[PDB]
Amino acid sequence: MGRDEAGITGTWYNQLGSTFIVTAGADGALTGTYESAVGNAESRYVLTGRYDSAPATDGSGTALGWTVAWKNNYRNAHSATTWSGQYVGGAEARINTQWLLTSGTTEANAWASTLVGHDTFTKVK
Amino acid sequence: MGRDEAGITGTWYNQLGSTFIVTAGADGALTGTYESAVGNAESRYVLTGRYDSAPATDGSGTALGWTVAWKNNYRNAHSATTWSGQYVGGAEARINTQWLLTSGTTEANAWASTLVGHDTFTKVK
Amino acid sequence: MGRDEAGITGTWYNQLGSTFIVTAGADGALTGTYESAVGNAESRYVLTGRYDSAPATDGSGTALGWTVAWKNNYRNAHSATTWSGQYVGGAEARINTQWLLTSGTTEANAWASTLVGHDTFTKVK
Amino acid sequence: MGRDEAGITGTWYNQLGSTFIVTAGADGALTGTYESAVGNAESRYVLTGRYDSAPATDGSGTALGWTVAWKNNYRNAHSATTWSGQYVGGAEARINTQWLLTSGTTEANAWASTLVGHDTFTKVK
């Protein structure tokens, strides 16, 4: 029943070679796994998030976000990334994001706790 | 079994007067509701996220994040915010975040799709 | 005498079709003009910034930034963008940035004052 | 002749204990020095930037930004910070910023090149 439930659900790849597998729920849920090609990461990590299940019908994209905390059975990078973005449908469907990666730090080092970047996900490559 | 499962779970308030109610799961889950005191928002919205359930024991904070998509039974703001941050425990416990708020836009307006800010959550006020 | 003084100075174009003309000084200065292909902007606007005039020699990029306040003789958009990034030299030289665009706002609307994005500049197109 | 030329020019202090000394020009220029209380920094560093010299008269703040590249005669941190923000005048005048700190990196590590934060400057402390 979600407008882009079908368009969003599946396997996505970003420009770093990371893989995001996601299921979109009718109501707005996102659940899945993430495997990063870079950084202090091995194998899959749990992800959860939310998307707008009833987007505007004027050619606008579909807002969404999700989170990964970088702990699984293999490693713990004491950090979490959140991606905020929009899904755009069609023959070259994309999810265009910006992300914030916060590490656990001492209060002294907190100023330097957060990295910022941008990932573009596609259904190919 | 999560290290800050107890410290995180509950009701938090930010500097805008918004209210975040969250349950932390032993494994890393965050689930809850968010009510914003500002913007195109009314009542509670679903939130989901992840936290590091086994943080460093050296006085570092606990990395976490979560997402709200701004649709509920009342309104649809065609947008989603993700908060990335760290929980710091103790008598003045805090969750210090930065956030990204993406709106669904046309490809023409996509450059201007994302707001960035910072929220500090406390257990009082 | 600046290491990338020569590589940086000139005309650059981003993915939106904007044009950045810059002179790099030996000491670290950047001065120039910016013309945005989008938004509340017409013609050229003054820019100033700074770059690292003695970068690492290990294949690392060259950190830099600059600012435009969106006032000139034609328009005043009551806003300023800052680009932070790195210059990478070679046959496909690039300046890879992230940017923050702050508008003047009332204290009530300050939460929503700042847009964030990413621009990639090239010497062609 | 700049509206907040007088309000902006002077010495400012942020929550980390850093010191920003700035002169505002009638036309929009900002020039000065910055001394960071944290990070890979010693003594003063050159800063340059721009502000809106004719802000809205409706109680809105005054948009501005500036850049520091972290090289001076003492150290070179192969990095640059840009602050984007707004000046708010009155008895408790403030400059409320967000900042992007980019390091020069290899193309492999570029994903992790940029830190993001927020500084609040005041005329006291």
From Swiss-Prot, chains A, B, C, D:
Domain Avidin-like: 5-125
Compartment(s) of residence: Secreted
Residues reported to bind biotin: 34, 45, 83, 99, 111
Keyword terms, alphabetized: Biotin, Secreted, Signal
Tagged with keyword Secreted: yes
Quaternary data: Homotetramer.
Name this polypeptide is given: Streptavidin
Organism (species): Streptomyces avidinii
Organism lineage string: Bacteria, Bacillati, Actinomycetota, Actinomycetes, Kitasatosporales
Included range, full protein: 38 to 158 of 183
